[PDB]
Structures are given as C-alpha cells and as structure tokens.
Design an enzyme around this catalytic site. Structure first.
Site, PDB file in Angstrom:
ATOM      1  N   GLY A 142      -6.730   5.591  -1.407  1.00  0.00           N
ATOM      2  CA  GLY A 142      -7.355   5.445  -2.702  1.00  0.00           C
ATOM      3  C   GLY A 142      -6.422   5.603  -3.879  1.00  0.00           C
ATOM      4  N   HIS A 157      -3.968  -6.428  -2.703  1.00  0.00           N
ATOM      5  CA  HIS A 157      -4.544  -5.906  -1.473  1.00  0.00           C
ATOM      6  C   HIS A 157      -6.054  -5.741  -1.606  1.00  0.00           C
ATOM      7  CE1 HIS A 157      -5.367  -3.090   1.816  1.00  0.00           C
ATOM      8  NE2 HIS A 157      -5.753  -2.202   0.919  1.00  0.00           N
ATOM      9  N   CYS A 171      -4.177   3.600  -4.444  1.00  0.00           N
ATOM     10  CA  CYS A 171      -3.767   2.246  -4.671  1.00  0.00           C
ATOM     11  C   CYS A 171      -3.975   1.807  -6.136  1.00  0.00           C
ATOM     12  CB  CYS A 171      -4.541   1.371  -3.687  1.00  0.00           C
ATOM     13  SG  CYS A 171      -3.937   1.590  -1.981  1.00  0.00           S
TER      14      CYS A 171
HETATM   15  C1  LIG Z   1      -3.080   0.108  -1.397  1.00  0.00           C
HETATM   16  N1  LIG Z   1      -2.796  -0.966  -2.117  1.00  0.00           N
HETATM   17  N2  LIG Z   1      -2.141  -1.840  -1.282  1.00  0.00           N
HETATM   18  C2  LIG Z   1      -2.070  -1.271  -0.081  1.00  0.00           C
HETATM   19  C3  LIG Z   1      -1.423  -1.862   1.177  1.00  0.00           C
HETATM   20  C4  LIG Z   1      -0.842  -3.116   1.199  1.00  0.00           C
HETATM   21  C5  LIG Z   1      -0.273  -3.583   2.381  1.00  0.00           C
HETATM   22  C6  LIG Z   1      -0.277  -2.811   3.534  1.00  0.00           C
HETATM   23 CL1  LIG Z   1       0.455  -3.423   5.042  1.00  0.00          CL
HETATM   24  C7  LIG Z   1      -0.850  -1.558   3.515  1.00  0.00           C
HETATM   25  C8  LIG Z   1      -1.410  -1.089   2.342  1.00  0.00           C
HETATM   26  O1  LIG Z   1      -2.631  -0.072  -0.157  1.00  0.00           O
END
Ligand SMILES: *c1nnc(-c2ccc(Cl)cc2)o1
Ligand SMILES: *c1nnc(-c2ccc(Cl)cc2)o1
EC number: 3.4.19.12
Lengths: 301, 301
Positions: free
Chosen positions: B143, B41, B145
C-alpha cells in the site's frame, strides 16, 4: 519491508508555527486556538541570563510588546500570562488550522517527532526519544527556540515538548506544553549537568524484534535467561532495568516472531558481552534505543 | 548544535496525496493541479505480473474505471494517459493546495525526503539517498505504492521519486515523476537484481566535516594524501571514485573548519584501513553516506 527512523507527518504542526518577538528576543511560537505558546526566554536579554527574575522582567512588559507574526499575518495580543517556563499570549484571531490537539507529558523512554523551526518557518522534521536523564539528542541551532515535539495518533496532535536550552554537553533540554521542564533543568545559564544517560532496554528489544521481521536474524541465539540474571548484565552495561510491564508490552512482538521475550534477552546479553563482531543489525553497528515497542508495530503494520 | 538525519517538512506534499483505485488495485496518487499521477501498476492484477502488456490492459480501461478519492472528496476523471511507467489521470477539480512544484530527475548520490502513504493517508516521513546502483533503502509496506520522494527548496517542491517495487534484496526501486525508472529496473516480476552498491564518497567526507563542527574530531589525523592515492583505497573498499567536482563542492566545508579536503581524505583513508576501534563519530559506529554536502550546510546554518 524495510525499517527506518521515521517521523510523523509535520503538516498539522506547520500550520501552528509562528514567530514571536519581544524586545530584542525573537523565537518560535505555537498557535493553538486563540493562544500563542512560547518559551519565556523571549522576554530576556543576554545580560540577565545568569539569574533572571522572569516575574519582574514581565511586569515591565505589556501586550503591545509581544510581536506575533504568522507568516506575514500579524496577530493582536489581548492578554499574556506566565505558566511555569512558558508564556501564553492571548491573540484576537483563532488559528483556522488548529488541529485536534492535547498537551501530554511523556515518560522517559517514549518517542516524539520534532519539527525544527527558525523564525517561525519549518526547516526539518526528525524523531527523538526522551532519554532516561530527561534530555534529548537532536539538532537545534540559534533560533530553534520554541520548536515543538509531537506525536500524531490518528487525528489528535499530542504536543509533548517545547525546546528551550542546549546544555554544555551538546544535548538539549525543554519543557512540556504547560511550562514544566523535563528533569532538574532550569532556564538559567547556571551550572547544569545531565545525569547518567542509561540505555532504554525495552526499546532495544523492540528494535531487535524489528530486525527478525526484516531479515537480520543472526543475533538469534540458542540460549535463554531469566529476568533477574539479564538485569545483572543490564546494570553492568548501564541499561535500564527491565520490568514485567516491559515484558508485557513486547508481547505482540514476541507473538508474531514466535520468539519469547526472555530468549531475546539472552541474545541481547550475548550482544552486550561479545559485541557484534563487525556485523550490522538493520544497517547499524550499534544498538538502537530510539524505537519504542509501538514504533515498531506502527512501521510493521 | 547537534546533527541529525533530517527530512523536509511534509506539509506541502500531504495536501497532494490521494487514493487511486482501478479494478482491484488500490494505491496512492499525487494530485498536482488538475492531474493525478500514479504508478501504472494500478491497472494490473496479481496474475498478469510476470509480464503484463500495460498497453492492452489500458485499452480495456476508461475514465470511469479510475477511482480518485482525496480524503473523502471524489474527483471526476476526464482523461487518462500512460507516460512511461506512470498514469496521468486528468480530473475536473484542480487541487487548491497545489504548491510551487517541478519534476526533477536526481543523480546517484543526491538525497530526498520520502512521505510514506497508505491508501492516500500520510504515515511517516524519512530521508533517503539515491544509491549508486539506482536503488533506495527505505520502509515500504503493502500500500505504499505511489509514495513520493521530494526536496523542498525555499518554496518549490521538487518531486523526484515515486515508489514502485521492492526487489528480492529488500531494497526499493522507483521512477521519476515522468515515469522513467532509476536504473535498469522494469515493473515486472522478472529476475531483477541491483548491481554493486558502492559508497558515495563525497557524502561521507561532508559527514566527517559535520562531525568536526559538532565536537567529534578524534579522526583528524596528522597525515595527508593525494587524490589518486585516495582513490586507490576508495576502490579497494568499494567507494565511489572521488572527482575534482567533489572536491570543489566540499570547499565551503573545508573553509569553515580550516581543514583541507585532501587532509580529510587521509583521515577517511585511515578509517577505512584501521576501522574506528570501537569509537563513534556523530553517534554512529559506521560511516554515513546519506548526507550530501548541501545537507550538511543546511543543518549547520
Ligand atoms: C506498487 N506499485 N507498483 C508495484 C509493483 C510493480 C511491479 C512489480 Cl513486479 C511489483 C510491484 O507495487
Ligand atoms: C531558546 N529558548 N530558550 C533558550 C534559553 C533559555 C535559558 C538559557 Cl540559560 C539559554 C537559552 O533558548
């Protein structure tokens, strides 16, 4: 989103956990700078535990009787002293992993993370709250002695708890990093009992606010109440009396949700008088009292 | 004694958390050896999130477009590749803090500790369980993520989860360290919904056993039942069907307490049919499903 019982990262405290042995007692120590802090129970045997004279038990001890072992690195003890219920063992090597630290004595209601250790090795990490009776509800087996409780704010590790005993109630009692027990507890196998464990009222309100932010809003009522009339119900259900200092700290929480503190108190009053009717709030069927108003804003920022 | 929701010490994983930025996306990465693992992402903008062509979005990226920052130390990217839903950024410096690690794909029911990070800095650590619908119930803000889930067995850090998305349900979905999502979830803002979240039956039994060890024994009944007749009640209350492999793992727990597994199943059958009558088990008014049979024996050893 989401809201969980969260503990601080224990990395900075792992590098300070050591293994201390004196005689036959072996427990965990805290290696900060060139001093190793450990419970003074380390110098005692299982016979002299009904009433030990720690002073006389220490006059027969010397620096070479204390065995400090960091992992496998053994430290040279060049001094020892007894500060209240802890022992300060002066070693020759300063810990290269000593973080920015301070010794804090917390108040009843504050929270801290506990790094459970056995023979100097970290086992797990969990969050605890200093109950109103100055006890904690954690997980301590044989060898968890010397395990520390801490808060990490920015870069300073604020050590506040060192584990000593488990009461017959199954609850746990300990000292600050200066050796002073929290509450009227002594390090003797005498008749010790904790008082009435009341509920930290201001922490429950903060937890209810965290529920409004994460979706659960069914407990929000259409009533309100006064501070004195809520303390009426709080005392009947053995809750901590709510103060104006408590209302002021919940200010930021009442500002984001747009729900006055006293309107939230009425919802708690209905929850104490009518229960939850089989529902859940943030995945719990009980009222959570281990989240301080700061714990919520940290996890909601 | 005592029994708490415990997470592994996060020290070994802190030394692997970094900050990755590409374009405008900034998230957390996992620095193991000379590779930085991060969610793919990172290469996407807020417009192409309904259906992004990650392949084409990466052909316009090169090594100098990925900014890896460990604390303040910046690493030189010398390679990049997309393995399923993660990106592998080859850097020039190997992490001096790389631990003994392995990439594990856990099964529904197993638990792991989650180190929540924001912009490469650890924030907190908590324990999670892979629900039967291949989702988790944690705490992830903007964040978080790239935050990882892990088990630490002895000296090997078994990475098993990397956080990606939050579903409209408030639950969280992620991938293993090879990029494969747990369940039927894709990294697109499409119509995604988790299935029926059943209850991990074998974990509840292990938690009931932990209660007998820590004092709470009121739920112990005078009845017993068979495996098929308990699965009758388990299906009606949306519980995972209990297998003989489940009975065998609970063997050590049934041996210490001297309570047969099927006798414990009858107590759970009474608890599902009659509730708890306002009582608590290990301080909870609900039935806990995030303790595996190994989680109990670890905290009870
Ligand atoms: C954080 N890391 N990936 C994501 C994310 C990926 C896909 C979608 Cl549809 C939303 C968030 O957020
Ligand atoms: C571990 N560290 N201290 C102790 C302890 C102290 C006093 C008594 Cl009565 C029991 C245990 O355990």
């Amino acid at each position: 989103s989401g809201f969980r019982k969260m503990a601080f990262p224990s990395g900075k405290v792992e590098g300070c956990m050591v293994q201390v042995t004196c005689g036959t007692t072996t427990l965990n120590g805290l290696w900060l700078d060139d001093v190793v802090y450990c419970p003074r129970h380390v110098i005692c045997t299982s016979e002299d535990m009904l009433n030990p004279n720690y002073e006389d038990l220490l006059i027969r001890k010397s620096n070479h009787n204390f065995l400090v072992q960091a992992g496998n690195v053994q430290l040279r003890v060049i001094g020892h002293s007894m500060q209240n219920c802890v022992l300060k063992l002066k070693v020759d090597t300063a810990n290269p992993k000593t973080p920015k630290y301070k010794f804090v004595r917390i108040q009843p209601g504050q929270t801290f993370s506990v790094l459970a250790c056995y023979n100097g090795s970290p086992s797990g990490v969990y969050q605890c709250a200093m109950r109103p009776n100055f006890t904690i509800k954690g997980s301590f087996l044989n060898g968890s002695c010397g395990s520390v409780g801490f808060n990490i704010d920015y870069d300073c590790v604020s050590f506040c708890y060192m584990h000593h005993m488990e009461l017959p109630t199954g609850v746990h009692a300990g000292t600050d990093l200066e050796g002073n027990f929290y509450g009227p507890f002594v390090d003797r196998q005498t008749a010790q009992a904790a008082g009435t464990d009341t509920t930290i009222t201001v922490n429950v309100l903060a937890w209810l606010y965290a529920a409004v932010i994460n979706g659960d809003r069914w407990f929000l009522n259409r009533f309100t109440t006064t501070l004195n009339d809520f303390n009426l119900v709080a005392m009947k259900y053995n809750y901590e009396p709510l103060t104006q200092d408590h209302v002021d700290i919940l200010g930021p929480l009442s500002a984001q949700t747009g729900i006055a503190v006293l309107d939230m108190c009425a919802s708690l009053k209905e929850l104490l008088q009518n229960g939850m009717n089989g529902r859940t709030i943030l995945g719990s069927a009980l009222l959570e009292d281990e989240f301080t108003p700061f714990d919520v804003v940290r996890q909601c920022s």
